[PDB]
């Protein structure tokens, strides 16, 4: 929650970070997506790649991204503190993000925030003592018709009840990985009581194509 760095023994510029060689090949593929002379444009993916390897960002991943992209380190610190995904503290193995903006709040995200809190025994911002679950409270995740919903590390868990999110935390603690989908009867975003549209077969290639084409 702070935006200055203080050197701790676990977060200092001599904390060991280095990319794996397959991550260096991934970084070469990232840098080749941008014009020559604008290698700095690969700050945001490569830094996120540093978060996908290490789980979070000590200030040697920031220094390594600054060093291999030849940008100043402050230009990486600005990116790491601007964007809300770069974990500058080590989060748990499952990073639960509960959306509590108004479309998810109107469909009772508070009940699911409370159910996660009384299932995990923590509150918002805390980590469980076994380092498995970090519960925070995020803004809109772009799944508004699937309100209420959470995100766990890559995955959207949608149309949730307190019982559904208790079941999801149960099968996360059991080592398995749950299905990233709506826990209600529907599949992605359709009306729940049957399709109100798109009930016809699609017309296929060439339908309605104008003349002169």
């Amino acid at each position: 929650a702070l935006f200055v760095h203080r050197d701790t023994p676990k977060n200092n510029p001599e904390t060991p970070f280095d990319f794996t060689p397959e991550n260096y090949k991934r970084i070469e593929a990232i840098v080749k997506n941008y014009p020559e002379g604008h290698k700095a444009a690969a700050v945001l993916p490569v830094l996120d790649l540093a978060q996908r390897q290490n789980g979070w960002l000590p200030i040697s991943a920031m220094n390594k991204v600054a060093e291999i992209l030849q940008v100043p380190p402050m230009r990486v610190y600005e990116v790491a503190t601007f964007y809300t995904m770069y974990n500058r503290k080590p989060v748990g193995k499952y990073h639960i993000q509960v959306c509590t903006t108004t479309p998810c709040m109107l469909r009772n995200s508070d009940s699911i925030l409370e159910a996660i809190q009384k299932k995990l025994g923590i509150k918002v911002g805390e980590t469980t003592p076994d380092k498995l679950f970090t519960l925070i409270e995020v803004e809109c995740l772009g799944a508004c018709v699937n309100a209420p919903m959470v995100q766990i590390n890559d995955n959207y868990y949608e149309d949730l009840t307190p019982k559904d999110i208790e079941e999801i935390i149960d099968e996360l603690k059991a080592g398995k990985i749950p299905k990233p989908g709506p826990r209600s009867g529907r599949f992605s975003c359709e009306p729940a009581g049957g399709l109100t549209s798109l009930t016809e077969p699609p017309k296929g290639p060439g339908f309605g194509v104008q003349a002169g084409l």
Binding site: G37, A40, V71, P72, M74, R75, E78
Partner: protein, 85 residues
Amino acid sequence: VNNTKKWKMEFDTRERWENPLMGWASTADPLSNLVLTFSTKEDAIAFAEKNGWSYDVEERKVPKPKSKSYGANFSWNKRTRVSTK
């Protein structure tokens, strides 16, 4: 820049010493606080010559016209890119 609009006539500073009682800045210069204000340079020169004061004149230093462009912060190939904003 509202103080750079007018011409000023000051004088050479003389000795300011420590008052033995209080440490105050004692002076013997009557013209120590005398700053005269003129609209042009020639008015100040005519007033200095009228009163017999040997003067010297510095010329008015304006800032030169700069070339500004907000798009120049984001050039394709020039060094004038900003790396932060």
